[PDB]
Amino acid sequence: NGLTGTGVLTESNKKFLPFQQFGRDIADTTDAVRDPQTLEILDITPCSFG
Amino acid sequence: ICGDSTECSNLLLQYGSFCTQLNRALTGIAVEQDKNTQEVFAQVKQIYKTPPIKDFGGFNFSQILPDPSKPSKRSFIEDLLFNKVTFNGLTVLPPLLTDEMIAQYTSALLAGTITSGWTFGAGAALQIPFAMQMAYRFNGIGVTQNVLYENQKLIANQFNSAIGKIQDSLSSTASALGKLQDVVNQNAQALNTLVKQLSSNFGAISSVLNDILSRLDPPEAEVQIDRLITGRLQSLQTYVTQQLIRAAEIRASANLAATKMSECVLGQS
Amino acid sequence: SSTASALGKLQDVVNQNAQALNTLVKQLSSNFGAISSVLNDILSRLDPPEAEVQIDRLITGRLQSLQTYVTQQLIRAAEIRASANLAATKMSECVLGQSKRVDFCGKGYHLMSFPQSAPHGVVFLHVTYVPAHEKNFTTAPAICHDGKAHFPREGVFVSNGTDWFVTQRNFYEPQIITTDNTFVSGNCDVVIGIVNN
Amino acid sequence: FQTRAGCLIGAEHVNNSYECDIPIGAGICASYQSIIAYTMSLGAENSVAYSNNSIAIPTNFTISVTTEILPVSMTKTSVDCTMYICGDSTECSNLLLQYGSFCTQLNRALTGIAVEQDKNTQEVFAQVKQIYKTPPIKDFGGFNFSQILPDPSKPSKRSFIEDLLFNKVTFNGLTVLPPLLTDEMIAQYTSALLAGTITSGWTFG
Ligand SMILES: *[C@@H]1O[C@H](CO)[C@@H](O[C@@H]2O[C@H](CO)[C@@H](O)[C@H](O)[C@H]2NC(C)=O)[C@H](O)[C@H]1NC(C)=O
Ligand SMILES: *[C@@H]1O[C@H](CO)[C@@H](O[C@@H]2O[C@H](CO)[C@@H](O)[C@H](O)[C@H]2NC(C)=O)[C@H](O)[C@H]1NC(C)=O
Numbered sequence: 001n002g003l004t005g006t007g008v009l010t011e012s013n014k015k016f017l018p019f020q021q022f023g024r025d026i027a028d029t030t031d032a033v034r035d036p037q038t039l040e041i042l043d044i045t046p047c048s049f050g
Numbered sequence: 051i052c053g054d055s056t057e058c059s060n061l062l063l064q065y066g067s068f069c070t071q072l073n074r075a076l077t078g079i080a081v082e083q084d085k086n087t088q089e090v091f092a093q094v095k096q097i098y099k100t101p102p103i104k105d106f107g108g109f110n111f112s113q114i115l116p117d118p119s120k121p122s123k124r125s126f127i128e129d130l131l132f133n134k135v136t137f138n139g140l141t142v143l144p145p146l147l148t149d150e151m152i153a154q155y156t157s158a159l160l161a162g163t164i165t166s167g168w169t170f171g172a173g174a175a176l177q178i179p180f181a182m183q184m185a186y187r188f189n190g191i192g193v194t195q196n197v198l199y200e201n202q203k204l205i206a207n208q209f210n211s212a213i214g215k216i217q218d219s220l221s222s223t224a225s226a227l228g229k230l231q232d233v234v235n236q237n238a239q240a241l242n243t244l245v246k247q248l249s250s251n252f253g254a255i256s257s258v259l260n261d262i263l264s265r266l267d268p269p270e271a272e273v274q275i276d277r278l279i280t281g282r283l284q285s286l287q288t289y290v291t292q293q294l295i296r297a298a299e300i301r302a303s304a305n306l307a308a309t310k311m312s313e314c315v316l317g318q319s
Numbered sequence: 320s321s322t323a324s325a326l327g328k329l330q331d332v333v334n335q336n337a338q339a340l341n342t343l344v345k346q347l348s349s350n351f352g353a354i355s356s357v358l359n360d361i362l363s364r365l366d367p368p369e370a371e372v373q374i375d376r377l378i379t380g381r382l383q384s385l386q387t388y389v390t391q392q393l394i395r396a397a398e399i400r401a402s403a404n405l406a407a408t409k410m411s412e413c414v415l416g417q418s419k420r421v422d423f424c425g426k427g428y429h430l431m432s433f434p435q436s437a438p439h440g441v442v443f444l445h446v447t448y449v450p451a452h453e454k455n456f457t458t459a460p461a462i463c464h465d466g467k468a469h470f471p472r473e474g475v476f477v478s479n480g481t482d483w484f485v486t487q488r489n490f491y492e493p494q495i496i497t498t499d500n501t502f503v504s505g506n507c508d509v510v511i512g513i514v515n516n
Numbered sequence: 517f518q519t520r521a522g523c524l525i526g527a528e529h530v531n532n533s534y535e536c537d538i539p540i541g542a543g544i545c546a547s548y549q550s551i552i553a554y555t556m557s558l559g560a561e562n563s564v565a566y567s568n569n570s571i572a573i574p575t576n577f578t579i580s581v582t583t584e585i586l587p588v589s590m591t592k593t594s595v596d597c598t599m600y601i602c603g604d605s606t607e608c609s610n611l612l613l614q615y616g617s618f619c620t621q622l623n624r625a626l627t628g629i630a631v632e633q634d635k636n637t638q639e640v641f642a643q644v645k646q647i648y649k650t651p652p653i654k655d656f657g658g659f660n661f662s663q664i665l666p667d668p669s670k671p672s673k674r675s676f677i678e679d680l681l682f683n684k685v686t687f688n689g690l691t692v693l694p695p696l697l698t699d700e701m702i703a704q705y706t707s708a709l710l711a712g713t714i715t716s717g718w719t720f721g
């Protein structure tokens with residue numbers, strides 16, 4: 001939905017409420033989104049590095 | 051600074067070799083920490099062991115000797131101390147020496163000083179009955195050794211009472227280990243502000259670089275990315291300098307601790 | 320003479336200084352965001368209004384580089400000063416006198432020391448005394464005689480199996496027990512370990 | 517192999533325990549034979565024979581001599597602003613003029629550092645008031661200081677050990693200033709100290 005990012009998508013059990021669209025954890029990092037066509041609570045996780 | 055962007059990396063390329071210096075400084079800090087631990091704790095070669103039978107002239111060291119029941123073989127006081135006190139491009143590296151090895155060094159040192167006296171700090175450990183060692187220490191401070199051999203029972207009794215009292219005081223009053231907690235809090239706060247600084251415009255149109263890439267024409271995207279780059283680089287430099295100062299102070303403290311262990315544990319000062 | 324790499328501290332101090340100076344001089348060849356890293360070419364290509372902007376970019380970048388170099392030099396100087404203070408204290412204590420603080424200079428009972436110069440430091444030769452060839456004996460804390468307790472003036476009681484002896488603590492040297500090297504304090508009915516002799 | 521530090525490819529895990537050559541982390545490290553990774557061994561294991569009526573007394577002794585190296589000084593350097601950042605350009609200097617007095621602080625810091633180095637050397641070495649000289653005839657109860665006393669034959673007036681040490685170890689607006697005290701003077705201080713401690717003991721302190 002216009003928000004671009006690279007990571008791995010995992011099904012999340014976070015309990016959103018019918019007016020949020022995307023959550024975050026801390027320091028302004030989009031941590032979970034809701035897909036427009038299914039209304040599903042996903043989970044963004046950065047790809048492995050080190 | 052860049053977060054895996056080709057354009058940002060290319061722009062940062064023409065800013066000289068700052069990052070090699072920063073990484074070198076941080077690696078030096080890490081190696082220095084490892085050396086501090088090694089030189090403050092690794093002071094003996096043989097790993098001495100206490101005898102199975104414990105008759106130390108009436109003294110009772112059970113509170114301090116390792117307990118085989120627990121897996122870590124940590125003493126009661128060590129367990130109390132341990133219980134008392136609690137990605138975006140940053141990593142934490144594990145220490146070289148694990149906690150069990152440190153506990154093993156402490157146990158070896160304590161067994162050596164509890165059986166052989168101070169002799170094990172110079173050559174090879176030579177056994178000595180504990181009462182005779184205490185008599186030697188009284189002779190050292192300026193009291194004839196008659197006093198110990200005539201008041202051994204009372205001396206042992208009040209020694210045990212004192213050790214129990216310090217155990218109880220440590221257990222009850224939580225506010226006992228302030229310095230370590232202060233160090234941990236300072237480090238955590240520095241990391242927190244460093245990671246929070248990433249959410250600033252620095253005069254640009256947005257605080258996120260991906261939107262700038264995906265929204266705007268390169269020719270002025272260089273300008274916006276330059277603003278972001280200079281701000282983040284300045285913040286990183288400040289953080290590195292603060293870390294260097296704190297590490298130097300910690301090194302001074304570690305040197306003092308090593309001297310204290312060498313002078314007061316291995317001998318009577 | 321044979322084994323090398325025994326003077327790592329002075330060598331890598333020199334290497335640190337040389338590396339810092341080398342990277343400082345290298346830093347002079349970066350654009351820092353401007354159109355070129357050579358001054359005159361920027362000067363003799365453009366008119367002043369943006370030539371001055373490019374000059375400002377060069378000036379500021381070189382300024383932070385120099386500032387960083389100075390700060391690093393200050394930190395290193397503080398560390399070296401601490402080391403020099405330690406060296407001065409060691410020279411004062413372990414060269415001009417015999418030290419008693421254990422493990423301050425050398426491992427073992429310290430005897431004396433010698434200084435030697437170095438390109439940017441000092442080398443101490445510590446002479447220490449280390450015992451060896453130990454023997455295991457039976458001991459006792461006091462001696463009962465006439466109902467009185469005797470303690471050694473300075474030494475310790477040992478026995479090779481028979482007849483008992485007094486000796487100094489750090490070197491085997493038995494001597495027959497006499498009233499001259501022992502002193503009396505009370506009757507022997509309270510000490511834990513008295514032996515009849 | 518999988519370790520608390522991550523993953524390791526190219527070495528063979530073993531169940532022995534030797535000293536630590538190349539530290540890796542979490543108490544384990546590797547070495548060469550092939551390359552093998554193992555757990556650190558803290559050292560030898562022994563149990564001193566404690567009893568309540570037994571002691572150990574030495575019967576002989578040894579005399580040991582050990583080294584200890586300590587740096588005391590570093591090179592004195594100075595840097596000029598206008599020569600460095602401007603490179604003899606009038607317009608560059610004019611532009612720099614309005615940036616405040618940073619360069620005065622920089623030069624002040626460098627000068628302070630150099631003075632500190634000189635003070636460090638002087639306070640470390642100049643511990644004596646008179647230069648003592650050993651007598652030409654040397655009969656020190658059987659002890660032999662030939663390798664340590666200065667050799668007048670050499671032009672440098674340095675001992676064998678000092679020569680070994682000295683041989684073993686190896687512009688754009690920046691300058692290096694010479695130290696105040698030359699090498700010969702430092703050697704003279706060392707010789708004075710050493711003769712004083714040989715002959716007078718600790719009394720000369
Ligand atoms: C040394 O101290 C420990 C603990 O203070 C003693 O262990 C106690 O022993 C008594 C008698 O068996 C028990 O009632 C306590 O519960 C024990 N305490 C703990 C914490 O377990 C030990 O007995 C002392 N040593 C000697 C020789 O008396
Ligand atoms: C302990 O040392 C004493 C002191 O030398 C020994 O006593 C002497 O032993 C020799 C060897 O048999 C005899 O020739 C002497 O006559 C003994 N001296 C006296 C005064 O009797 C003693 O034998 C040693 N004991 C042990 C077990 O080593």
Ligand SMILES: *[C@@H]1O[C@H](CO)[C@@H](O[C@@H]2O[C@H](CO)[C@@H](O)[C@H](O)[C@H]2NC(C)=O)[C@H](O)[C@H]1NC(C)=O
Pocket residue numbers: 105511512568569
């Ligand atoms: C040194 O330890 C031994 C054994 O631990 C003690 O020997 C005991 O002595 C008492 C006193 O007569 C006897 O009742 C015991 O039977 C002995 N035990 C053994 C195993 O023989 C000896 O008393 C201790 N010496 C001291 C503390 O000076």
Ligand SMILES: *[C@@H]1O[C@H](CO)[C@@H](O[C@@H]2O[C@H](CO)[C@@H](O)[C@H](O)[C@H]2NC(C)=O)[C@H](O)[C@H]1NC(C)=O
Pocket residue numbers: 463514515
């Ligand atoms: C040391 O000698 C004294 C005196 O010769 C011994 O004391 C005697 O002990 C016996 C046995 O307990 C008693 O029957 C006597 O009445 C004691 N006499 C006196 C004067 O006290 C003592 O037992 C000896 N100690 C040892 C370890 O042999």
Ligand SMILES: *[C@@H]1O[C@H](CO)[C@@H](O[C@@H]2O[C@H](CO)[C@@H](O)[C@H](O)[C@H]2NC(C)=O)[C@H](O)[C@H]1NC(C)=O
Pocket residue numbers: 453454455565
């Ligand atoms: C020290 O005295 C002991 C007395 O038993 C001598 O024997 C040693 O005893 C300990 C205690 O069990 C053993 O662990 C050692 O293995 C024994 N030694 C030997 C050689 O078997 C011992 O010889 C004496 N000397 C030393 C240096 O320990």
Ligand SMILES: *[C@@H]1O[C@H](CO)[C@@H](O[C@@H]2O[C@H](CO)[C@@H](O)[C@H](O)[C@H]2NC(C)=O)[C@H](O)[C@H]1NC(C)=O
Pocket residue numbers: 452575576577
């Ligand atoms: C103390 O140790 C020294 C050094 O090992 C011994 O001196 C050696 O003695 C042997 C046998 O007499 C000689 O072969 C060596 O040449 C001696 N070495 C030196 C450097 O002199 C000495 O004998 C030992 N003393 C005792 C009492 O054990």
Ligand SMILES: *[C@@H]1O[C@H](CO)[C@@H](O[C@@H]2O[C@H](CO)[C@@H](O)[C@H](O)[C@H]2NC(C)=O)[C@H](O)[C@H]1NC(C)=O
Pocket residue numbers: 660661662663
């Ligand atoms: C002190 O030690 C030096 C070590 O070099 C001795 O000098 C050597 O002496 C031997 C025996 O006379 C000669 O063969 C060597 O050629 C000498 N070496 C040098 C470099 O001169 C010196 O003799 C010793 N002093 C005493 C009094 O024994």
Ligand SMILES: *[C@@H]1O[C@H](CO)[C@@H](O)[C@H](O)[C@H]1NC(C)=O
Pocket residue numbers: 036037038
């Ligand atoms: C969007 O249309 C597709 C096509 O049938 C359908 O599967 C999906 O459920 C629709 N989603 C919404 C939110 O209407």
Ligand SMILES: *[C@@H]1O[C@H](CO)[C@@H](O)[C@H](O)[C@H]1NC(C)=O
Pocket residue numbers: 529530531
């Ligand atoms: C080492 O010991 C473990 C058991 O702790 C065993 O499973 C393993 O096969 C042994 N050998 C190696 C090479 O790990």
